[PDB]
Design a protein around this ligand. Structure first.
Ligand SMILES: Nc1ncnc2c1ncn2[C@@H]1O[C@H](COP(=O)(O)OP(=O)(O)O)[C@@H](O)[C@H]1O
Lengths: 56, 375, 55, 55
C-alpha cells in the first residue's frame, strides 16, 4: 500500500538532486571569475621632479 | 594558454553583455552593449582619443561621446558594433581568441531568425571560431535555477520572453513573447523625473537614469497601498546622488516606473503585463502540465532585482489562477546572471558536445545552419 | 640660486602636493572602498543574518 | 624673498612631503584595511553562501 508513495517521493528527490548536482558541480569545479582582483594604485611616490615632456 | 579548450560563453543583451569561460560560475566581465563615438571637435593633439570606444571604454569616456546600443528587443541590428564588442569581450578582456575555443551565444526561442543566423555567421567568419552553438535563454535560466519545469520569465532590458517548459520540453504554442522591457522602464523614468523637475534627454542623462533605477526603484507587491502613502508623504522618498553632486528624490515614481511591467499602458503599450503573460503561458498548456508550471514560475534576467517583483509576480498570478492550486515564484540570487551561468552549465555538459556546429558544417551550409543544428 | 632652489623647492612642493593630493585621492578612494567594504560587510553580515535566519 | 620663499617652499615641500609620508601611512593602513575588509566581506559573503546553502 505504501510502495508508490515511497517511489514517488524518491523520484522527486532524484530529479531535484540531479538538477542541483549539475549546477553545483560547475559551481565547485571552477571558481576564479566568481572571485575578485587587487585593483591596485599608482601614487607616484618616486616623482621627485618634472618629466622630460614639454608639458611638464 | 587555457587548461582546456572549453567554450567561451557570452550573453549579449540589449542592456549588458557578459562573458567568461565555460565551467565557471560567473562572467569575468560585464560591459554595457555599447559602442561610443565622439560628438565634439577635438582641439588638442596627442591626447590619444579613439574614433570609437567599446563597452566600458565607451561608458568611461562618455562625457563627450554619443552612445549607441547595437541590440534592441533581443536582436542585433548593428553587427559591426557587435563585432567590436565581441573582440573586446573575448580577446581584449577574457584574453582568449575565439579562434582556439568554441563559442556559446544566446537568444530567445522566438527571437527573429536573422539574429541567431548573424551571430553564427560573425563568430565563424570574422573570429574563425572552430565551433558554434546559440543557446536558448530559457534553457539556460532553467540550468542555472536547477529546474526542468516552469515558466521562464526573463524580464530583461530588451524583451520579456514568457516561455513554458515541461520536463525539458518547450510548449511553443503557449509562449507569450512580449515587447515590454527594462529599457522602456528607463525611458519612462526619464520622462516621469522630467515631470518632477529633473529633465533627462541625452546619453549622459539616460545613463544616470539607468543608475537611478538600478539603485532606487522597486515594484511593490501591493502598489495601491504603497502609492497611497508614497504619493502623500516625503517619508517614502529616496535620495540619489548625481555625478555632479546634485540630489534627486523620487517618491511613488520610484515604483510606478517598474509598475509598468504590470501596467504597460504607462508607456503606450497594449499588453496584459508580465503576470498575465505568465498566467497564459501556464494556462495555454495542457492541464497535466499546468499543475507543475503554476508551482514553478521561474524568474530570470535583470529587473528581477527590484524588491517586490517576485512577490508581486506571485500575487498577481495567484489572483488569475484557479483556487486550491499552489502558485510559486522561484527567484534565485543567480538573477540577471542566470543566463550566463546556465550557458556555462550547458557548455560543460558531456552531452552538449554533440550539439556544436563545427567550422566545416558551417561553411558547407552557411549561417542558415543555426536553424538545423541549434534551434 | 635662491630662486632656482626655490623653483626646485616649489616644484618639490608642487609635486609633493600633487602627491599629497594624489595620496588623498587614493586615501579617499581606498577609505571609500573601505567604508563601502564595511557598508557591504555590514550588509553582508545583515544578509548573513538573513541567510542564517533562512537557515 | 627667494631665500625666504625657499625656506618656506622647502618647508612647504617638507610639509607636503611629510603629508605625503603621513598619507603614505594612511594609504598603507587603509589599503591593508581595505584588503582586510574585502576579506571580511568575502568572509561574510562566504558565510552567507554557506548559511544560505545551509538554508
Ligand atoms: N539593481 C537592479 N535593479 C533593477 N533592475 C536591474 C538591476 N540590475 C540589472 N537590472 C536591469 O536588467 C536589465 C539587464 O537585462 P539582462 O537580463 O541582464 O540581459 P542579459 O540576459 O543579456 O543578461 C537592465 O535594464 C538593468 O537596468
Amino acid at each position: 500500500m505504501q510502495a508508490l508513495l515511497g517511489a514517488r517521493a524518491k523520484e522527486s528527490l532524484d530529479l531535484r538532486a540531479h538538477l542541483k548536482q549539475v549546477k553545483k558541480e560547475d559551481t565547485e569545479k571552477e571558481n576564479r571569475e566568481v572571485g575578485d582582483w587587487r585593483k591596485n594604485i599608482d601614487a607616484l611616490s618616486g616623482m621627485e621632479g618634472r618629466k622630460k615632456k614639454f608639458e611638464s | 594558454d587555457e587548461d582546456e579548450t572549453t567554450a567561451l560563453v557570452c550573453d549579449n543583451g540589449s542592456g549588458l553583455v557578459k562573458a567568461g569561460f565555460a565551467g565557471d560560475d560567473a562572467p569575468r566581465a560585464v560591459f554595457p552593449s555599447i559602442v561610443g563615438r565622439p560628438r565634439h571637435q577635438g582641439v588638442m593633439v596627442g591626447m590619444g582619443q579613439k574614433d570609437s570606444y567599446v563597452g566600458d571604454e565607451a561608458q568611461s569616456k562618455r562625457g563627450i561621446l554619443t552612445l549607441k546600443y547595437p541590440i534592441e528587443h533581443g536582436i542585433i541590428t548593428n553587427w559591426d558594433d557587435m563585432e567590436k564588442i565581441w573582440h573586446h569581450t573575448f580577446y581584449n578582456e577574457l584574453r582568449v581568441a575565439p579562434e582556439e575555443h568554441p563559442t556559446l551565444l544566446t537568444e530567445a526561442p522566438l527571437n527573429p531568425k536573422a539574429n541567431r543566423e548573424k551571430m553564427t555567421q560573425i563568430m565563424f567568419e570574422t573570429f574563425n571560431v572552430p565551433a558554434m552553438y546559440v543557446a536558448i535563454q530559457a534553457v539556460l535560466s532553467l540550468y542555472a535555477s536547477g529546474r526542468t519545469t516552469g515558466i521562464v520569465l526573463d524580464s530583461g532590458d530588451g524583451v520579456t520572453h514568457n516561455v513554458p517548459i515541461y520536463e525539458g520540453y518547450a510548449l511553443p504554442h503557449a509562449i507569450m513573447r512580449l515587447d515590454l522591457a527594462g529599457r522602456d522602464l528607463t525611458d519612462y523614468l526619464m520622462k516621469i523625473l522630467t515631470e518632477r523637475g529633473y529633465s533627462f534627454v541625452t546619453t549622459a542623462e539616460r545613463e544616470i537614469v539607468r543608475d537611478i533605477k538600478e539603485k532606487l526603484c522597486y515594484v511593490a507587491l501591493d502598489f495601491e497601498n504603497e502609492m497611497a502613502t508614497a504619493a502623500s508623504s516625503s517619508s517614502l522618498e529616496k535620495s540619489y546622488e548625481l555625478p555632479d553632486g546634485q540630489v534627486i528624490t523620487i517618491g511613488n515614481e520610484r515604483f510606478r516606473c517598474p509598475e509598468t511591467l504590470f501596467q504597460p499602458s504607462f508607456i503606450g503599450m497594449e499588453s496584459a503585463g508580465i503576470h498575465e503573460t505568465t498566467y497564459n503561458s501556464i494556462m495555454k498548456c495542457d492541464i497535466d502540465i499546468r499543475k507543475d508550471l503554476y508551482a514553478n514560475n521561474v524568474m530570470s534576467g535583470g529587473t528581477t532585482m527590484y524588491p517586490g517583483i517576485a512577490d508581486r509576480m506571485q500575487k498577481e498570478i495567484t489572483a488569475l489562477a484557479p483556487s486550491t492550486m499552489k502558485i510559486k515564484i522561484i527567484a534565485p540570487p543567480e538573477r540577471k546572471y542566470s543566463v550566463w551561468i546556465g550557458g556555462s552549465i550547458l557548455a560543460s555538459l558531456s552531452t552538449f558536445q554533440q550539439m556544436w556546429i563545427t567550422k566545416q558544417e558551417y561553411d558547407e551550409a552557411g549561417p542558415s545552419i543555426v536553424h538545423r543544428k541549434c534551434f | 640660486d635662491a630662486q632656482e632652489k626655490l623653483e626646485l623647492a616649489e616644484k618639490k612642493a608642487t609635486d609633493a602636493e600633487a602627491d599629497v593630493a594624489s595620496l588623498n585621492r587614493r586615501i579617499q578612494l581606498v577609505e571609500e572602498e573601505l567604508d563601502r567594504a564595511q557598508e557591504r560587510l555590514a550588509t553582508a553580515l545583515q544578509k548573513l543574518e538573513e541567510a542564517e535566519k533562512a537557515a
